Structure formats: structure tokens, C-alpha cells
Design a protein around this ligand. Structure first.
Ligand SMILES: *[C@@H]1O[C@H](CO[C@@H]2O[C@@H](C)[C@@H](O)[C@@H](O)[C@@H]2O)[C@@H](O[C@@H]2O[C@H](CO)[C@@H](O)[C@H](O)[C@H]2NC(C)=O)[C@H](O)[C@H]1NC(C)=O
Ligand SMILES: *[C@@H]1O[C@H](CO[C@@H]2O[C@@H](C)[C@@H](O)[C@@H](O)[C@@H]2O)[C@@H](O[C@@H]2O[C@H](CO)[C@@H](O)[C@H](O)[C@H]2NC(C)=O)[C@H](O)[C@H]1NC(C)=O
Ligand SMILES: C[N+](C)(C)CC(=O)N/N=C/c1ccccn1
Ligand SMILES: C[N+](C)(C)CC(=O)N/N=C\c1ccccn1
Ligand SMILES: *[C@@H]1O[C@H](CO)[C@@H](O)[C@H](O)[C@H]1NC(C)=O
Ligand SMILES: *[C@@H]1O[C@H](CO)[C@@H](O)[C@H](O)[C@H]1NC(C)=O
Ligand SMILES: *[C@@H]1O[C@H](CO)[C@@H](O)[C@H](O)[C@H]1NC(C)=O
Ligand SMILES: *[C@@H]1O[C@H](CO)[C@@H](O)[C@H](O)[C@H]1NC(C)=O
Ligand SMILES: [Cl-]
Ligand SMILES: [Cl-]
Ligand SMILES: [Cl-]
Ligand SMILES: [Cl-]
Ligand SMILES: [Cl-]
Ligand SMILES: [Cl-]
Ligand SMILES: [Cl-]
Ligand SMILES: [N+]
Ligand SMILES: [Zn+2]
Ligand SMILES: [Zn+2]
Length: 527
């Protein structure tokens, strides 16, 4: 029986059997004052000391959120849905420790994605006990507020200043700084990693001065702050905030007196009104996201990046081959997870209206013109794959590549990857390829469990990725040095080399999406 004395009081963990050994788990450690009552919409308050033994033996409450329901009973959407109660009392974090207690172990801190509207750290594919067991690192994950309750912005107003979820994360980073030592961790060797909006989060942590000293290195999986969906400006933050008030009957004149109205509304009142704060949404819509608050963010992030105003350190950045296909079955006409989704030129044209609603007719013609120069004009899946590439190149890949070029231009080592393996267990149809979110299980080493009926080639690739992530965390270099692997080159802005990750062969390529990204990053802004 192990109990660790944190600065805030004693906490009792539990022991797990992983791969013939032990990992100690502390699920559900509180790291903030519960943000309810008058604390709703506010920055996270500090934790009051306690004098008993907190039993950190089960996952905590998940933060209030709206749940995916487009496919009830379907594992492919429900693996992402919360697996603990929803409650405003949700600011908790988890710690996996190798056994026996390491001395000065590198800490990995996971920040989950979900469009800043959904997510929870208790998901099975975020289980950190494999990483603890295999690479003797410490894995920490936290829950952070999402949707309106985590990102409602009345800018300047401390009653709802914006970016509360990001301050939740930061307060958890503060926690492992003040406490990880007692678990055997090295507060000086802390690597942030996250996926989708989690990756956008860690990219903002590279910019936030208040995060500069709370971590060492950073891993960005399928996301960056410069992605079109990732930052909401101040005028849409306010139109959205005031729309929600009109929806709940909280329109008041005194700016502050709008907030106390929302603070006495039930959590489900705000949740079901969230979707309608934008007049025309898209499958990629982030209704309440990060803003320039003058606190977490001191200025617009694109300016900070372009002028080298970020934490200088190594980064690991990468994308998946079919980032965009997940979003097609949530909106585009003619798409279905239950057929081959072969669409015509006409249907391709109406998908662009879904994904680019307020963009010109000349804008949409140029997208179609760039993405329809086929090798084979007879392929019936031409337009299907093309609209998938359009959505994936615009929302994830081209921003991620631009982030890596601009970050590396200031002298730091950067490492870019291209994940192109489709999981043998992936419950979505084959036409959707290597989907958004489905490298996560490889990173967390789930195929390392042979009972889980992953393929043998998948155990090897996960083992090699798990090693490259932990080598990057520990030593700032994502090599696998022993089994004669391909050496991962630095991403230099001149040649733009990256590593493809897959079962058959890891090769070195250059200038991922050369043409597609020039169009999206240089031309498409001007239309
Ligand atoms: C700023 O917001 C207004 C408000 O729109 C409504 O706000 C809530 C009450 C909610 O019910 C939303 O779904 C509403 O749309 C936007 O005004 C609307 O704009 C659309 C088209 O853009 C128009 O068809 C509606 O008639 C407008 N509604 C009203 C009440 O005038 C407005 O568009 C937003 N700002 C910008 C620049 O678009
Ligand atoms: C692929 O399937 C989509 C999905 O819609 C189907 O509609 C049901 C009636 C049923 O047949 C289910 O298997 C699917 O969910 C098809 O798109 C629909 O097409 C019909 C007829 O043309 C139209 O009335 C609907 O509005 C369409 N709905 C959507 C969301 O697009 C599509 O035609 C199928 N294509 C192929 C090649 O199989
Ligand atoms: C919509 N759903 C109920 C499945 C929750 C969710 O997943 N919301 N996510 C939005 C988003 C936006 C941009 C990039 C990635 N994700
Ligand atoms: C939820 N996730 C961690 C995958 C990121 C996200 O928000 N993805 N967005 C849509 C989606 C929905 C189901 C399956 C795949 N992608
Ligand atoms: C914590 O767990 C121990 C071991 O089961 C138990 O004896 C103790 O009463 C628990 N404390 C609680 C639930 O407050
Ligand atoms: C842990 O490592 C740091 C350097 O990274 C060192 O300064 C510190 O004293 C070490 N502490 C322990 C307990 O090993
Ligand atoms: C109303 O506005 C004033 C300033 O305009 C502010 O000081 C006050 O706190 C607000 N709310 C209440 C309940 O007075
Ligand atoms: C290297 O090869 C050995 C022998 O097959 C294997 O057991 C080990 O897990 C491999 N390590 C990595 C990091 O791939
Ligand atoms: Cl050892
Ligand atoms: Cl055609
Ligand atoms: Cl046409
Ligand atoms: Cl097919
Ligand atoms: Cl096999
Ligand atoms: Cl290899
Ligand atoms: Cl062009
Ligand atoms: N290319
Ligand atoms: Zn999403
Ligand atoms: Zn490709």
C-alpha cells in the first residue's frame, strides 16, 4: 500500500499489473477548487489544504459537455464519448508511476483534444499505464473545462475573461511542478503532448509566458494554434457570448450582470444553447475556443509566432494521412460510414459549400480547380477522396507544416512525422483511411497488449513509436537507436524533411503537400 504526501495533503494510489510488472496509478487527484457557484466562468482557484487521505483510486468526473450521437451503439463514435459522470466539479488529474518508484523520471503530460467542446482524460486510449511500464516515464493527464463553461469570453471582464480551460491545464502543469518530485518525477524534464485541440493547446503553451517555466519540450499531434478552427477572435467571442445570453434570457445591460445570470442557469441550459451561437456552423466549428485575453495570450498568436515570441525548445509535430475524412460523414452530402460514399462532381461542389460557407463563388472554384487534376479521370472515388484531402489539408496538415517551418526558423530542432497506418481494429469503413485521432492508440502503446488482437506488425510499430516519443521526451531527440531504425532527420525550413511512420517501412521524404499547402497558406487567404 503506497501513499504519497503531496503539498496539499496525503493521497493514496493503487497498483496495477501491466505486462508481468507493476504500475502505480493515482486516478483523480484534485488540482483546483471546484469551479462552481460564483466560481463558474472564472479562472481556476487554488486548492484548499486537506488533512485526511484522499483516495485517488478511480477516474474523476468529466467536465460538462455535449455528447456525440450521430451513431448510437457505434464504437467508432462512442470510444470518444465521456466515460465518467459529467459535472462542473471536474478539475482532476491522473498520475501513472512505474514500479518501483523511479528516481528523477521524465514526466509526460497529456492534453486531450475534442474541438475545445468535448473530451475527458479517462478515455481508454489515453491510459498511461503502458507508457509507465515500458519506458519508465511518468504519465500525467488532466481534465480541463470545455465549451462555454471553459471558454466563454467577455474580454477584459474578469467574470468571464476567456481561456479558463487553458488556465485549468496551466494550473495542472503548476501542480506537477510543485508535486511530481514526491512521485519520483523530474519537474525539470516535462514534455507536453496532445492531439487535435490538445495539440493546439500545447502550441499555445509555447506562447503563454505563464507556461514557459512549467515544461521542457512539446509534442503536437494533428493540430496547432494557427489551424483555421483553433482561435476565435474577439468580435466573434463577443457575438457568441451575447447570442448565448439572448438564448438563455440573460441579456442584461451591465456587462457583469449578464454573467451572474448565466451563473444561476443550470449547466444543461448552457449546453443545449451552445450550438446556436454561430449562425452558420460547419463540422469543424469551435463555438467557444481560445481567445486573445491579454492574460494567457498577450497578443494574436500568428504575430507571436512570426516574430519569434515563443519558448525556444525542441518540438515534435505530425499529422495523419486521412485527417479530413471523419468530418465528411458528419455533414457532406452523399457520405456515410455504411457505404463506399462515391459522390459526383455535383455533390463535391455542395460539400465545399458545407465546409466553406462564407467563401466566394470564385473561392470555391479555385479549390475545385486545384484538387481535380487527376491521374485517372475514370476513378469513381476521385471526388470522394478529393473532398477528404481538401478538408484535411486545409484544417490540419498545412497549418501543422506552417507551424513547424516558422518555429524552426528561430534555431530550434523540429521533427515532423506523417502517420499512414490504418489500425487493424479501426471500426470505421476502409474508405476513410488513416483517420483523425487513430494514431493515439499507437502512441499510448495499446498494441503492446497481445490479447487486444492488434496485428504483430502493429506491436512493433507501436513499440518503435513509444520509444521515439520517450526518447524525445528524455533527450530531445526522437530516435529509435538500437534496432537499426531509419534515422529521423531535423525539419529544416530549407528542405522540410519528415519521417513517414507505418508498419512496412519508415522512410524520409521532403515537402509534404508542397502544392496543396502553397495554395491554402499563400493564395486562399486572399480570396
Ligand atoms: C452576430 O449575431 C447575430 C445574431 O444572430 C442570432 O443570434 C442568436 C440569437 C442565435 O439565435 C443565432 O442563431 C442567430 O443567428 C447574427 O445575425 C443573424 O445573421 C444571419 C445571417 O448572418 C441572419 O440570417 C439573421 O437574420 C441574423 N439575426 C438577427 C437577429 O439579426 C450576425 O450575423 C452575427 N454577426 C455577423 C457579423 O455575422
Ligand atoms: C450512401 O449512403 C448515403 C446515406 O443515406 C442513406 O439513406 C437511407 C435512406 C439509407 O439508404 C441508408 O443506407 C443511408 O443512410 C446516401 O445518401 C442519401 O441518398 C438518398 C437517395 O439518393 C437521399 O434521399 C438522401 O437524402 C441521402 N442522404 C445523405 C445524408 O446524403 C448515398 O446516396 C449513398 N451512396 C452510395 C453510392 O451508396
Ligand atoms: C461533434 N462531437 C459531438 C463529435 C464532439 C467533437 O468531437 N467536437 N470536435 C470539434 C472539432 C473541431 C475542430 C477540430 C477537431 N474537432
Ligand atoms: C475526438 N477526437 C479525439 C477524435 C478529436 C476530434 O475532435 N475529432 N473530431 C471528429 C471525430 C469524431 C469521431 C471520430 C473521429 N473524429
Ligand atoms: C480509502 O481506501 C481504503 C482501502 O480500501 C479504505 O479502507 C478507506 O476507508 C477509504 N477511504 C475513504 C473511502 O474515504
Ligand atoms: C534531477 O535532475 C536534475 C537535473 O535534470 C538535478 O538538478 C536534480 O538534482 C535531480 N534530482 C534528483 C533527486 O535526482
Ligand atoms: C454593474 O456595473 C457597475 C459599473 O458599471 C459595477 O461596478 C457593478 O459591479 C455591476 N454589477 C452590480 C451588481 O452592481
Ligand atoms: C528491438 O528488437 C527486440 C527484438 O525483437 C524487441 O524485443 C524490442 O522490443 C525492439 N525494440 C524497439 C524499441 O522496437
Ligand atoms: Cl530498471
Ligand atoms: Cl466530371
Ligand atoms: Cl461546373
Ligand atoms: Cl472504396
Ligand atoms: Cl498477426
Ligand atoms: Cl524502420
Ligand atoms: Cl492559385
Ligand atoms: N507534393
Ligand atoms: Zn472533434
Ligand atoms: Zn498520401
Amino acid at each position: 500500500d503506497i501513499i504519497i504526501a503531496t503539498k496539499n495533503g496525503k493521497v493514496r494510489g493503487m497498483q496495477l499489473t501491466v505486462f508481468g510488472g507493476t504500475v502505480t496509478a493515482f486516478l483523480g487527484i484534485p488540482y483546483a477548487q471546484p469551479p462552481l457557484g460564483r466560481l463558474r466562468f472564472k479562472k481556476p482557484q487554488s486548492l484548499t489544504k486537506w488533512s485526511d487521505i484522499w483516495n485517488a483510486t478511480k477516474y474523476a468526473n468529466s467536465c460538462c459537455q455535449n455528447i456525440d450521437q450521430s451513431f448510437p451503439g457505434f464504437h467508432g463514435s462512442e470510444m470518444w464519448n465521456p466515460n465518467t459522470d459529467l459535472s462542473e466539479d471536474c478539475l482532476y488529474l491522473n498520475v501513472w508511476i512505474p514500479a518501483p518508484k523511479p528516481k528523477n523520471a521524465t514526466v509526460l503530460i497529456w492534453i486531450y483534444g475534442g474541438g475545445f467542446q468535448t473530451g475527458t482524460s479517462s478515455l481508454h486510449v489515453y491510459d498511461g499505464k503502458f507508457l509507465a511500464r515500458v519506458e519508465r516515464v511518468i504519465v500525467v493527464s488532466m481534465n480541463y473545462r470545455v465549451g462555454a463553461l471553459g471558454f466563454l469570453a467577455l474580454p477584459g471582464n474578469p467574470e468571464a475573461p476567456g481561456n479558463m480551460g487553458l488556465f485549468d491545464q496551466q494550473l495542472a502543469l503548476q501542480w506537477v511542478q510543485k508535486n511530481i518530485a514526491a512521485f519520483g518525477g523530474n519537474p525539470k524534464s516535462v514534455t507536453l503532448f496532445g492531439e487535435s485541440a490538445g495539440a493546439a493547446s500545447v502550441s499555445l503553451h509555447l506562447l503563454s509566458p505563464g507556461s514557459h517555466s512549467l515544461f521542457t519540450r512539446a509534442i503536437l499531434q494533428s493540430g496547432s494554434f494557427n489551424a483555421p478552427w483553433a482561435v476565435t477572435s474577439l468580435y466573434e467571442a463577443r457575438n457568441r457570448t451575447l447570442n448565448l445570453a439572448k438564448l438563455t434570457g440573460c441579456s442584461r445591460e451591465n456587462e457583469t450582470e449578464i454573467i451572474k445570470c448565466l451563473r444561476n442557469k443550470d449547466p444543461q441550459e448552457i449546453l443545449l444553447n451552445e450550438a446556436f451561437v454561430v449562425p452558420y456552423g460547419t463540422p469543424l466549428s469551435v463555438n467557444f475556443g481560445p481567445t486573445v485575453d491579454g492574460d494567457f495570450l498577450t497578443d494574436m498568436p500568428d504575430i507571436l509566432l512570426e516574430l519569434g515570441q515563443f519558448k525556444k525548445t525542441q518540438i515534435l509535430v505530425g499529422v495523419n494521412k486521412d485527417e479530413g475524412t471523419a468530418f465528411l460523414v458528419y455533414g457532406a452530402p452523399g457520405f456515410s460510414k455504411d457505404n463506399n460514399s462515391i459522390i459526383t462532381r455535383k455533390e463535391f461542389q455542395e460539400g465545399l459549400k458545407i465546409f466553406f460557407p462564407g467563401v466566394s463563388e470564385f473561392g470555391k472554384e479555385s479549390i475545385l480547380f486545384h484538387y481535380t487534376d487527376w491521374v485517372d479521370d475514370q476513378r469513381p472515388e476521385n471526388y470522394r477522396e478529393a473532398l477528404g484531402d481538401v478538408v484535411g489539408d486545409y484544417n490540419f496538415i498545412c497549418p501543422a507544416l506552417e507551424f513547424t517551418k516558422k518555429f524552426s526558423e528561430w534555431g530550434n530542432n523540429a521533427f515532423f512525422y506523417y502517420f499512414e497506418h490504418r489500425s487493424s481494429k479501426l471500426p470505421w469503413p476502409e474508405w476513410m483511411g488513416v483517420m483523425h485521432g487513430y494514431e493515439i492508440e499507437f502512441v499510448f502503446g495499446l498494441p503492446l497488449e497481445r490479447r487486444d488482437q492488434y496485428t504483430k506488425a502493429e506491436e512493433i510499430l507501436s513499440r518503435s513509436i513509444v520509444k521515439r516519443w520517450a526518447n524525445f521526451a528524455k533527450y530531445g531527440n526522437p530516435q529509435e537507436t538500437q534496432n537499426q531504425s531509419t534515422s529521423w532527420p531535423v525539419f529544416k525550413s530549407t528542405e522540410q524533411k519528415y519521417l513517414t511512420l507505418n508498419t512496412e517501412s519508415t522512410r524520409i521524404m521532403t515537402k509534404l503537400r508542397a502544392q496543396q499547402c502553397r495554395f491554402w497558406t499563400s493564395f486562399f487567404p486572399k480570396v
